[PDB]
Amino acid sequence: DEEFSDMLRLFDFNKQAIQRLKAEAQMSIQLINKAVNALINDQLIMKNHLRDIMGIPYCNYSKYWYLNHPKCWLVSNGSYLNETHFSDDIEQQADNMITEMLQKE
Amino acid sequence: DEEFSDMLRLFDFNKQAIQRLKAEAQMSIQLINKAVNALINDQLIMKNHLRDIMGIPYCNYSKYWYLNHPKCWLVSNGSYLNETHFSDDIEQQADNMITEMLQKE
Amino acid sequence: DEEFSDMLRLFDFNKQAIQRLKAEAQMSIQLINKAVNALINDQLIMKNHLRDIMGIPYCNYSKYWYLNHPKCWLVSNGSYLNETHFSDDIEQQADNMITEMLQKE
């Protein structure tokens, strides 16, 4: 049981690295989603006020196949990005995994 | 060979965490790239139609050194973001690594 | 000390996966921040030149609680995204951790 504790200590360091990287990348992405969402907000305001471009329409579903490529608005009110949350049960199934490992020992 | 199986089980859990985090972060980024690309699209349409701002030019290469800081367009047709795909050979070199580990045993 | 070297080799492969994923995700995000920042730049230029929309004001702090939801500019000069750098001391505390592991052995 002494060699398995060193095993766990290696395992746990990496598990912590994974946990921290998720936490930081998520923070970083959520900050991105906030700016991209607010750009969208303001860009839809200008599209409703600027008279030169009120004549231009929004693309309709044919939009999900101009990404495989188009003079129409791609950004609409559905263009908003949803909050991004990664799976966080790392500290859970890991506790489970090794508890099943100790009930044989 | 019984202590090495517990080693592998710890190793494999973390490997799976890494694989899932990559998969989710990538999904999350690719969704970002789609909104940022379509903003760019529409913003370049407004730049070609709004008459008040047709007089403003696009910055020319001196643009890659206003990021170290500028009344000209930074976003042009080269501003699009490329599809982001992370390395995925995790399930490959890991199989290789431990197969070389078992042919001595 | 022969079973601990296989332990370390498993540990080190995953540590490398973590290091590479951080490196790639960061590259990917920093590219995003550059496009989102330059969109912001240009969008603030159009907000200062287009006469149809000079009458529209910027939201004032009541902005950090329209994200819980608003006809005012959400994107201002504070909207820029800061350079994102993830913790990179992985190759450091890992060397520390196992050096303390070898001074007992």
Numbering used by the authors:
A (entry chain A), B (entry chain A), C (entry chain A): 306 to 374, 381 to 416
The authors write:
The two RNA segments in its genome encode four viral proteins, including zinc-binding protein (Z), RNA polymerase (L), nucleoprotein (NP), and the surface glycoprotein precursor (GP, or spike protein). GP is cleaved into envelope glycoproteins GP1 and GP2. GP1 that is responsible for receptor binding (including α-dystroglycan, heparin sulfate, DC-SIGN, etc.) and GP2 that mediates membrane fusion interact with each other to form a stable trimer complex on the LASV viral envelope. The GP2 protein contains a N-terminal fusion peptide (FP) (residues 258-295), a N-terminal HR1 domain (residues 295-363), a linker T-loop domain (residues 363-386), a C-terminal HR2 domain (residues 386-431), a transmembrane domain (residues 431-453), and an intracellular domain (residues 454-491).
To reveal the interaction between HR1 and HR2 domains of LASV, stable 6-HB covering HR1, T-loop and HR2 domains (residues 306–432), was constructed for crystallographic study. After the single mutation of C310S was introduced, the trimeric LASV 6-HB protein was obtained. Then we continued to try different truncations and deletions in 6-HB, and finally found that a deletion of Gly378 and Lys379 in the T-loop region could yield protein crystal with enough quality for structure determination. The overall structure of the HR1-T-loop-HR2 domain showed a canonical 6-HB structure. Taking a rod-like shape with a length of ∼75 Å and a diameter of ∼40 Å, the LASV fusion core contains a parallel trimeric coiled-coil of three HR1 helices (gray in Figure 2A), around which three HR2 helices are entwined (green in Figure 2A) in an antiparallel manner. According to the structure shown in electrostatic potential surface, the HR2 region of LASV can be divided into two parts: a linear N-terminal region and a helical C-terminal region. The linear N-terminal region binds to two adjacent HR1 helices through hydrophobic interactions, consistent with other fusion core structures, as previously determined. Moreover, at the junction region between linear and helical parts of HR2, several strong hydrogen bonds and salt bridges are noted. For salt bridges, Asp402 interacts with Arg325 (∼2.9 Å distance), and Glu404 interacts with Lys320 and Gln324 (∼3.2 Å and 3.6 Å distances, respectively). These relatively concentrated hydrophilic interactions constitute an anchoring point in the middle of HR2 domain, stabilizing the linear and helical region of HR2 and also the whole 6-HB conformation.
